[PDB]
């Protein structure tokens, strides 16, 4: 996981928010393998 972090692998994510008005919650349909 130190290699993973070092090469640019990111955190487990699902929900996001756009900061450009109008704000809206966008969620990833299926969890990333």
């Amino acid at each position: 996981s130190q290699h993973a972090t070092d090469i640019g692998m990111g955190p487990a994510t699902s929900c996001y928010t756009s900061t450009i008005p109008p704000p809206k919650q966008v969620c990833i349909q299926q969890a990333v393998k």
Partner: protein, 382 residues
């Protein structure tokens, strides 16, 4: 009425060459860009941070026929069956055509001022993680200029090698893939974008290759050859541009390059040779046989119009100031303007029909490390 030579040591190429100061303007890795740290859930992550677009760059997935632009594999799909792009969501934020981005932001006045690449970048960079964010972490994007499509990237990773870290074996479908950044025909219309790319990248960043030109170093009144370069065989401009990109500033662990690296190259289109170097250029040499390229630059676009008037404009500009103080500019297309004590030499490879006055007192020179230094005789005056 007197005429004399100025002792002021400047450089007429300053405003023109600013976009080629990759360390100042991009300020991060090129081949592999992972210049910004981000803390998410008390864990540290690396994200691309470059302020310039990287033209023609894509990610090659080893022993896979899936393009990196395909969404990442999700749940019921195997890692190796997907790409790097953002997966399907409740709102279709990625991939997004230009027409879709234009519809989405039709009421946003400020966003109507953005160019296609800046619009794709701003769109992708607007998405913050929900709930406890506190993070500066954003996803990078890839804008396809041919398909006019914006792709948000789920993965910020650009290179993965080493049998213990990845499996190139296509018969091992469950494990992690091997990948590397590269430039090739299939990626030529692509624009790799970190969250930090300048909206005014067209004025501040490289794009087009400079025809009838080679990068050089300004040495007291003339643009001189870079002494320490690495020569490589390159069949064409695309090859030279691929070589310089491969050798360019890398943030990949062996880790922040800050844009330092072998970012620039001179292509000899007659000899079929690529000369790569790691020192920022400060001027151009007008040579009909060369193309000046960078690791950020488009793999194919060429601007053949050398700025011929740069020297004459500056001489004439200064003369608009009886004491005449001529600037330390020893090259021009108006041979008489230089006021050379001997006959100026006619540069045959110069499309601008430049003349150079070689017979003048030089106050600077280039040393072993491509550093331009003031001569010892003059160090005290300056």
């Amino acid at each position: 009425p007197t005429v004399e030579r100025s002792t002021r040591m400047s450089n007429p190429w300053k405003a023109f060459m600013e976009k080629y100061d990759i360390e100042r303007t991009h300020s991060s890795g090129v081949r592999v860009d992972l210049g910004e740290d981000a803390e998410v859930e008390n864990a540290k992550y690396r994200i691309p941070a470059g302020r310039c677009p990287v033209f023609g760059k894509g990610i090659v997935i080893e022993n896979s026929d899936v393009s990196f632009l395909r969404p990442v594999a999700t749940g019921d799909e195997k890692l190796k069956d997907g790409g790097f792009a953002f997966p399907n969501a409740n709102d279709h934020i990625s991939p997004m055509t230009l027409a879709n981005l234009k519809e989405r932001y039709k009421d946003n006045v400020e966003m109507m001022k953005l160019n296609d690449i800046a619009l794709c970048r701003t769109h992708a960079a607007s998405f913050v993680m929900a709930g406890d964010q506190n993070s500066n972490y954003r996803h990078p994007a890839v804008y396809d200029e041919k398909e006019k499509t914006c792709h948000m990237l789920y993965l910020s990773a650009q290179e993965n090698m080493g049998p213990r870290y990845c499996s190139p074996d296509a018969q091992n479908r469950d494990a992690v893939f091997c990948f590397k950044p590269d430039k090739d025909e299939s990626f030529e219309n692509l624009v790799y974008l970190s969250k930090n790319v300048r909206n005014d990248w067209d004025k501040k960043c490289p794009r087009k290759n400079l025809g009838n030109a080679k990068f050089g170093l300004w040495v007291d009144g003339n643009c001189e050859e870079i002494p320490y370069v690495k020569e490589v065989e390159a069949e064409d401009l695309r090859e030279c541009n691929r070589i310089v990109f491969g050798a360019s500033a890398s943030d990949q662990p062996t880790f922040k390059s800050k844009g330092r690296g072998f970012n620039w190259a001179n292509f000899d289109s007659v000899k079929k040779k690529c000369y790569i170097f790691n020192t920022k250029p400060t001027c151009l040499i007008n040579d009909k046989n060369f193309i000046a390229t960078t690791a950020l630059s488009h793999p194919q676009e060429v601007d053949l119009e050398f700025p011929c008037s740069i020297y004459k404009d500056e001489i004439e500009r200064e003369i608009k100031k009886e004491r005449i103080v001529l600037p330390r500019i020893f090259i021009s297309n108006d041979k008489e303007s230089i006021k050379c004590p001997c006959e100026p030499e006619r540069i045959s490879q110069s499309t601008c029909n430049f003349y150079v006055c070689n017979c003048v007192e030089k106050r600077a020179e280039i040393k072993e490390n491509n550093q331009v230094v003031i001569k010892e005789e003059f160090r005290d005056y300056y």
